[PDB]
Amino acid sequence: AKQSLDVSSDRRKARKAYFTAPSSQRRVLLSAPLSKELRAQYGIKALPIRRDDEVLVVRGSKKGQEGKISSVYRLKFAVQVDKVTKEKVNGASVPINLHPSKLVITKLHLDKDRKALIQRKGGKLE
Amino acid sequence: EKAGHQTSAESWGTGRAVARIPRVGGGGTGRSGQGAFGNMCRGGRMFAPTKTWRKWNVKVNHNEKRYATASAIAATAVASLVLARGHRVEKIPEIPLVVSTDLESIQKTKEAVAALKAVGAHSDLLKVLKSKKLRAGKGKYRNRRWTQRRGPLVVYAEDNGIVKALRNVPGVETANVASLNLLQLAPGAHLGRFVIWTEAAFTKLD
Amino acid sequence: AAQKSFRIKQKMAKAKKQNRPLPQWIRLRTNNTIRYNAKRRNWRRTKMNI
Amino acid sequence: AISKNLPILKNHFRKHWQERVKVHFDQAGKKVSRRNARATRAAKIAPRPLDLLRPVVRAPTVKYNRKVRAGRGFTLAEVKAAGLTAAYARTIGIAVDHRRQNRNQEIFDANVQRLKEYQSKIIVFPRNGKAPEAEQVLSAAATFPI
RNA sequence: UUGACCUCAAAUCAGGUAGGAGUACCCGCUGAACUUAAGCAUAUCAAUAAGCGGAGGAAAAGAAACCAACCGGGAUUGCCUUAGUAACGGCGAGUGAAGCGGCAAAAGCUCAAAUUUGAAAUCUGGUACCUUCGGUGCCCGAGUUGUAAUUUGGAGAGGGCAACUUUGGGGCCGUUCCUUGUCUAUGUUCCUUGGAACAGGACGUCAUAGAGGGUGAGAAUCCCGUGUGGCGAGGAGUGCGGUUCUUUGUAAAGUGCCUUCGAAGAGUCGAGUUGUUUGGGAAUGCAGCUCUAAGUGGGUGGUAAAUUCCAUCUAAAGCUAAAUAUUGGCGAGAGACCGAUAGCGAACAAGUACAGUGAUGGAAAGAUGAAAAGAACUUUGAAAAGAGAGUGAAAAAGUACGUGAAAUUGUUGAAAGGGAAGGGCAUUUGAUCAGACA
RNA sequence: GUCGAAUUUGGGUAUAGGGGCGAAAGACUAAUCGAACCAUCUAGUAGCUGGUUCCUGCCGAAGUUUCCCUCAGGAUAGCAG
RNA sequence: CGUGGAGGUCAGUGACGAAGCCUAGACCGUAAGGUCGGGUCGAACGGCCUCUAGUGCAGAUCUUGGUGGUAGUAGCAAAUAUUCAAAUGAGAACUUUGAAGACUGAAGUGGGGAAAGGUUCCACGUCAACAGCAGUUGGACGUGGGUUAGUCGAUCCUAAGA
RNA sequence: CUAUCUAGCGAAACCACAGCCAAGGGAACGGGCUUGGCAGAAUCAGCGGGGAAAGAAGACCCUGUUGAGCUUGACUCUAGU
RNA sequence: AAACUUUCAACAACGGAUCUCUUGGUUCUCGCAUCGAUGAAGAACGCAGCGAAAUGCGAUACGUAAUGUGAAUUGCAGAAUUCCGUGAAUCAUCGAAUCUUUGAACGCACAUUGCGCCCCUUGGUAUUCCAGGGGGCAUGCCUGUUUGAGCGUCAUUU
Ligand SMILES: [Mg+2]
Ligand SMILES: [Mg+2]
Ligand SMILES: [Mg+2]
Ligand SMILES: [Mg+2]
Ligand SMILES: [Mg+2]
Ligand SMILES: [Mg+2]
Ligand SMILES: [Mg+2]
Ligand SMILES: [Mg+2]
Ligand SMILES: [Mg+2]
Ligand SMILES: [Mg+2]
Ligand SMILES: [Mg+2]
Ligand SMILES: [Mg+2]
Ligand SMILES: [Mg+2]
Ligand SMILES: [Mg+2]
Ligand SMILES: [Mg+2]
Ligand SMILES: [Mg+2]
Ligand SMILES: [Mg+2]
Ligand SMILES: [Mg+2]
Ligand SMILES: [Mg+2]
Ligand SMILES: [Mg+2]
Ligand SMILES: [Mg+2]
Ligand SMILES: [Mg+2]
Ligand SMILES: [Mg+2]
Ligand SMILES: [Mg+2]
Ligand SMILES: [Mg+2]
Ligand SMILES: [Mg+2]
Ligand SMILES: [Mg+2]
Ligand SMILES: [Mg+2]
Ligand SMILES: [Mg+2]
Ligand SMILES: [Mg+2]
Ligand SMILES: [Mg+2]
Ligand SMILES: [Mg+2]
Ligand SMILES: [Mg+2]
Ligand SMILES: [Mg+2]
Ligand SMILES: [Mg+2]
Ligand SMILES: [Mg+2]
Ligand SMILES: [Mg+2]
Ligand SMILES: [Mg+2]
Ligand SMILES: [Mg+2]
Ligand SMILES: [Mg+2]
Ligand SMILES: [Mg+2]
Ligand SMILES: [Mg+2]
Ligand SMILES: [Mg+2]
Ligand SMILES: [Mg+2]
Ligand SMILES: [Mg+2]
Ligand SMILES: [Mg+2]
Ligand SMILES: [Mg+2]
Ligand SMILES: [Mg+2]
Ligand SMILES: [Mg+2]
Ligand SMILES: [Mg+2]
Ligand SMILES: [Mg+2]
Ligand SMILES: [Mg+2]
Ligand SMILES: [Mg+2]
Ligand SMILES: [Mg+2]
Ligand SMILES: [Mg+2]
Ligand SMILES: [Mg+2]
Ligand SMILES: [Mg+2]
Ligand SMILES: [Mg+2]
Ligand SMILES: [Mg+2]
Ligand SMILES: [Mg+2]
Ligand SMILES: [Mg+2]
Ligand SMILES: [Mg+2]
Ligand SMILES: [Mg+2]
Ligand SMILES: [Mg+2]
Ligand SMILES: [Mg+2]
Ligand SMILES: [Mg+2]
Ligand SMILES: [Mg+2]
Ligand SMILES: [Mg+2]
Ligand SMILES: [Mg+2]
Ligand SMILES: [Mg+2]
Ligand SMILES: [Mg+2]
Ligand SMILES: [Mg+2]
Ligand SMILES: [Mg+2]
Ligand SMILES: [Mg+2]
Ligand SMILES: [Mg+2]
Ligand SMILES: [Mg+2]
Ligand SMILES: [Mg+2]
Ligand SMILES: [Mg+2]
Ligand SMILES: [Mg+2]
Ligand SMILES: [Mg+2]
Ligand SMILES: [Mg+2]
Ligand SMILES: [Mg+2]
Ligand SMILES: [Mg+2]
Ligand SMILES: [Mg+2]
Ligand SMILES: [Mg+2]
Ligand SMILES: [Mg+2]
Ligand SMILES: [Mg+2]
Ligand SMILES: [Mg+2]
Ligand SMILES: [Mg+2]
Ligand SMILES: [Mg+2]
Ligand SMILES: [Mg+2]
Ligand SMILES: [Mg+2]
Ligand SMILES: [Mg+2]
Ligand SMILES: [Mg+2]
Ligand SMILES: [Mg+2]
Ligand SMILES: [Mg+2]
Ligand SMILES: [Mg+2]
Ligand SMILES: [Mg+2]
Ligand SMILES: [Mg+2]
Ligand SMILES: [Mg+2]
Ligand SMILES: [Mg+2]
Ligand SMILES: [Mg+2]
Ligand SMILES: [Mg+2]
Ligand SMILES: [Mg+2]
Ligand SMILES: [Mg+2]
Ligand SMILES: [Mg+2]
Ligand SMILES: [Mg+2]
Ligand SMILES: [Mg+2]
Ligand SMILES: [Mg+2]
């Protein structure tokens, strides 16, 4: 259990801190786990999802589908995959909204910084 | 304490074909005209509003306190009570259950769970952790959310890492002999907790 | 009125500006809650008290 | 409003007493804060022991005089018979009291002997720099019981 | 004529300070009545509410003109007690403290009155430079109607005699304290149900981590955290640990004996009287007016007075951390609390909408679904809509949207009804149904 | 009724609650007047009026004594558990 | 007996349907109540030993909210008054235009202002609500446009007074 | 001009449950209770017998150890003088 | 016999109880000491590509600078050069700025966007009139500076 005096087990406080979290904080909550491949590749279990990454839906009814993240919708706590959409009745397609904890990262998108993140978590990077 | 009293309402007195509770003054809102202050009034003050100087704790004479926990210890033998209490003890060798003092030096959960298993704890540990349900009440949202049974209570003479080893395994409490809380010896005021004593602790008892 | 102080006309102007309905694009925003304009005012219904 | 056979109570709640109720909900809180206080101080205070040397003194009136009890400070006389001045004894952790007088030799000697034993049983580090780390004893009252 | 001095002016003169806010807690002033007394004025409520002035992070109090009466104690504050006691009181209703004792925290001091008189030794300001919370040089200025050193009653000061002992001020780096950033385990394997697995079963792993929240349903092991640790960053600061540069000094301080002294607060203390207040009682404090001291004096010693003693302090000037308070403010952790008529009035564009000339008064109002997938298209219609269709796990979820009670309403079905209806015991008839045979 | 004046009347201005203003009715002082309105003291007090929320089991009264500024109320004895 | 919550326990019930709600269907209890079926529903909840209380309603001219009978009822009757046609429109007693009949009778139902409102002005669009019948009309609703100063007011002056 | 009938629009008071009598007894004037008279759907315009109809916790009267405006050689004070 | 009234049921109304929710409230505890003439608290009016409000801001106006993060914002449009980068962002942090008309509110007023004075500067042929730009002028009190007043009063002239 919590041993620190600055942690709060309070449920009402957690749920406030989630929904009222600023854009910067949602970035890290919106982490997705690396694929078993990419994990032993990079020596790292999970990373905050970013836009042009590549991803496989491992949960839900889009289970098995893959694509490129078209946008991180931080406001909505949802990530959108280009290639995963609803065809509507009038035929106009519309994005589905996915949660990064139900995705898996199959290809990263690397930066000077995106690399340094992997290095700051203590893992190899091919 | 200022609740329900935050208005200037007065009774309209008799003669209006309307009851006598004070009523909010003025107009244009419809708050105005409504019963105020009353214990039966919407928005009124409650009857006998709760106060903080109510008695919360309770004094128990130190000696009878001891008599109680003595009694509670003496019942952690007597396998019928431990059995009647929950506590799957049929598969354990003997009661009191005394264990090597080496147990107090175990530094690691898995090791300590393994130790407990070897001595018979297993089915009790499994009784917890098969038992965790959602608290039925509104306590569920009061930071009381989950629930479960009580596991075995490991008693040591000196904490060499046993206290931190078992601290994460559901249901298990650890206690120095020197303390011995009555709340854990008879949880829910029910005698016969399953107690796993180390030998060092078992002798300090005398 | 019909000869007014500038403070009176100034307030009078700000109330003209507040007299529209809910701009309908707000209605579409994420978590949008506001339905209509509930502060809307009419000249023969509620008076401005200056 | 008087009936049966009952003691006559005198319960003074005719003022607005609910205004002035004090429930000590902070008992446990302030005990911790007092323990932390002492801890933080013992650290700031170097090996020095949190408390000052206190004299033997005979407790006043007819009821308590049979018992002897710790006083405030040491009476410029008693300080002088132990061979140090007031100003220096204050820097040494001895409490000095200019107001107390000696009418009684037996107590006078007890406090001079108390001062003697204290001087022997302490070490006073040099002004210089060195501070030869000495491990604080926290009491004086416990080391020098009365 | 010229130059001071005293006192009083003026500058958009050079530099500063005050106001207002808040006010939970704190220091003062002012000040009720409802109420209680079974009526009522003294009393009580209450030295309370409202009104006024003033502070702080605490305020105030504080190094005894104290308590005591003992073998005496020894600043203040607070808690436990003293004690519902001593005492006050139409001695009625009611009121009501203190000393001792235990504990928390502890801490002590500085002026006035002294000839530096072989040297105003002191200080604001301006100005130039400097190592700028400051230093130094110089000039105006203050100030002898007294600015420094020295001394504060515990003392202490001037002489004379005799010995030892003891230092100051900078830099700089840590730690301390403050603000922060980052990183740090373990399944998303199989089967079943489901729209969704976060459910049940199987088989595992981590656990100094099985607090918590998130994710399409009860998720330690999907995510963020949690636990244990690691690595940084920016500060403040003299608390102290190290270091290191200057020796402050022909400086400062402590101690023993001899001797001479020993300055110590006035329209005050105190007294009378009046009013108020207090448990304070021939008067507890406070204030007005009149009277007004002394220096082996003065104050107190809880029954007025005269005499004689005794004990105990040293007023009429001053500073001071902690233990203490806190329905305010900033930041946190919580609960056998309330759960949308509850809980703050306000879970919402709530002190809003609205009322009132104004002071002020002041509501109602949360919930489609995992996802808008918020109904394409056809048909009837002037339209709104209807009927199809479509979406959805479900429209028995359609922005009138979770569940959707009751009063009350429509339809359909059944039955009864000569100025109410409803009810009790009993049985006919109709409808409906349990159990039990074997 | 009166209608050229002790006339009618706008605006500005003064007077404020035991106070104002009154050719005097206790009139008028913002639908409020034998003491306006607002908030607070205040949940004022009420021997008086109204209400007081589940079941069953056993026992089961009093309206009388005495005192009371007592007579719609208390205390006291009695009856009751 | 029954409610909210708390300790213990039955490794209790449940998305293969918890709770709730409905039901002249069933069963247990003298009763407070308990139990089951069916329907509806959608995420939680119960038994037992103990703890706890903001714990049980028919009344209080009770509080707030909702709803009836009354009842398609009282009524929509002051200010003399309307009528024919055409246009428009899904739709015309009520809008537009033409015609007729009237009225206010300059002490105006006329032409402008002060106070007060504050956009009601004007145009275009336009009928869900509103104008106690209607509505194509409007002081409504939507979207826009419009208020030009050396000489007109303010501003300056003084009045009671502040 | 209403009422009245129609189209549109459409409230309120009030309401234990209700609504035919005579007698009786009864809280001494019953819609209900006892005994009789009687009694047939559903209704429209009127009406003022009854509903001890409605409208306000009776203004009168008494009680209350409840007030307030006013007066006075009531008690007790007080600005002023 | 209907209609009508009434009772029960089903389905549909009305209405929003109930159950289950909870970014709110309440109460306790712990830590801390920071408003304002260096213009506070409060007020008014403004500010977005498309806003009435709420929240934020001040003509540099849902923001400018700086620092950390490291790719968003998102209702629509949008820019596109912002994606191995002095760089996205309704982000976090915040140390630099801007900060209308006001307010203790300070040139005087204020039911007025009313009315003065001084200084520097620019334009109009301008020390003097008009216009634009910038900077100023409240009150009490303290220390000091400077110009003073009084037979209050000392001296010094010839
Ligand atoms: Mg990370
Ligand atoms: Mg009524
Ligand atoms: Mg309330
Ligand atoms: Mg429940
Ligand atoms: Mg009007
Ligand atoms: Mg308004
Ligand atoms: Mg208003
Ligand atoms: Mg008390
Ligand atoms: Mg407190
Ligand atoms: Mg101490
Ligand atoms: Mg040192
Ligand atoms: Mg100046
Ligand atoms: Mg102030
Ligand atoms: Mg009271
Ligand atoms: Mg009384
Ligand atoms: Mg009384
Ligand atoms: Mg009275
Ligand atoms: Mg008093
Ligand atoms: Mg008093
Ligand atoms: Mg006050
Ligand atoms: Mg004040
Ligand atoms: Mg402050
Ligand atoms: Mg403190
Ligand atoms: Mg002293
Ligand atoms: Mg003391
Ligand atoms: Mg008494
Ligand atoms: Mg008193
Ligand atoms: Mg969940
Ligand atoms: Mg979870
Ligand atoms: Mg951590
Ligand atoms: Mg003195
Ligand atoms: Mg007074
Ligand atoms: Mg007195
Ligand atoms: Mg005497
Ligand atoms: Mg003494
Ligand atoms: Mg001083
Ligand atoms: Mg002081
Ligand atoms: Mg608090
Ligand atoms: Mg509410
Ligand atoms: Mg409740
Ligand atoms: Mg409310
Ligand atoms: Mg819902
Ligand atoms: Mg709802
Ligand atoms: Mg349809
Ligand atoms: Mg269909
Ligand atoms: Mg459903
Ligand atoms: Mg539904
Ligand atoms: Mg729809
Ligand atoms: Mg529904
Ligand atoms: Mg029946
Ligand atoms: Mg059968
Ligand atoms: Mg059968
Ligand atoms: Mg009055
Ligand atoms: Mg009065
Ligand atoms: Mg007066
Ligand atoms: Mg009125
Ligand atoms: Mg009036
Ligand atoms: Mg009451
Ligand atoms: Mg009352
Ligand atoms: Mg009575
Ligand atoms: Mg009997
Ligand atoms: Mg008497
Ligand atoms: Mg009676
Ligand atoms: Mg029970
Ligand atoms: Mg339930
Ligand atoms: Mg039924
Ligand atoms: Mg059955
Ligand atoms: Mg169900
Ligand atoms: Mg749900
Ligand atoms: Mg119980
Ligand atoms: Mg209750
Ligand atoms: Mg009810
Ligand atoms: Mg009722
Ligand atoms: Mg009842
Ligand atoms: Mg009711
Ligand atoms: Mg109709
Ligand atoms: Mg009609
Ligand atoms: Mg009529
Ligand atoms: Mg007519
Ligand atoms: Mg017509
Ligand atoms: Mg005519
Ligand atoms: Mg005429
Ligand atoms: Mg219409
Ligand atoms: Mg209208
Ligand atoms: Mg109409
Ligand atoms: Mg219409
Ligand atoms: Mg318009
Ligand atoms: Mg003119
Ligand atoms: Mg002008
Ligand atoms: Mg006809
Ligand atoms: Mg009709
Ligand atoms: Mg008869
Ligand atoms: Mg009759
Ligand atoms: Mg009747
Ligand atoms: Mg009649
Ligand atoms: Mg009637
Ligand atoms: Mg009455
Ligand atoms: Mg009276
Ligand atoms: Mg009166
Ligand atoms: Mg008389
Ligand atoms: Mg007289
Ligand atoms: Mg939910
Ligand atoms: Mg809370
Ligand atoms: Mg915005
Ligand atoms: Mg930002
Ligand atoms: Mg001014
Ligand atoms: Mg101006
Ligand atoms: Mg200017
Ligand atoms: Mg001066």
Spell out the key features of this protein.
part of a larger assembly, 4 chains, B: 206 residues, alpha/beta, 7 helices, D: 146 residues, mainly alpha, two-stranded antiparallel sheet, flat, binds magnesium ion, RNA-binding, cytoplasm (chain B), methylation (chain B), Large ribosomal subunit protein uL4A (chain B), RNA binding (chain B), ribosomal protein (chain B)
Description:
The structure is cut from a larger assembly and holds chains A (126 residues), B (206 residues), C (50 residues) and D (146 residues). Chain A is α+β, with helices and mostly antiparallel strands. Chain A contains 4 helices and 8 strands. Chain A has helices at residues 11-19, 23-29, 36-42, 112-120; strands spanning 31-33, 46-48, 54-57, 66-73, 78-82, 85-87, 93-95, 103-107. In chain A, the strands form 3 sheets. Chain A has a 4-stranded antiparallel sheet, with no helix packed on it. The N and C termini of chain A lie far apart (37 Å). With 206 residues, chain B is of the alpha/beta class. The longest helix of chain C has 12 residues, at 6-17. Chain C starts with 5 loop residues before the first helix and ends in a 33-residue tail after the last helix. The relative contact order of chain C is 0.17. Chain C has one helix spanning 6-17. With 50 residues, chain C is mainly α. Chain C is elongated and about 45 Å long. Chain D has 146 residues and is mainly α. Chain D is built from 5 helices and 2 strands; from the N terminus they run H-E-H-E-H-H-H. Chain D has helices at residues 27-44, 61-64, 76-81, 86-91, 105-120, and strands spanning 56-58, 68-70. Chain D is flat, with a radius of gyration of 23 Å. Chains in contact: A-B, B-D. Chains A and B meet through loops of A and loops of B. Chain B binds 5 RNA strands through helix 3 and helix 4. Chain B: Its main location: cytoplasm. Chain B: One of its GO terms (molecular function) is structural constituent of ribosome.
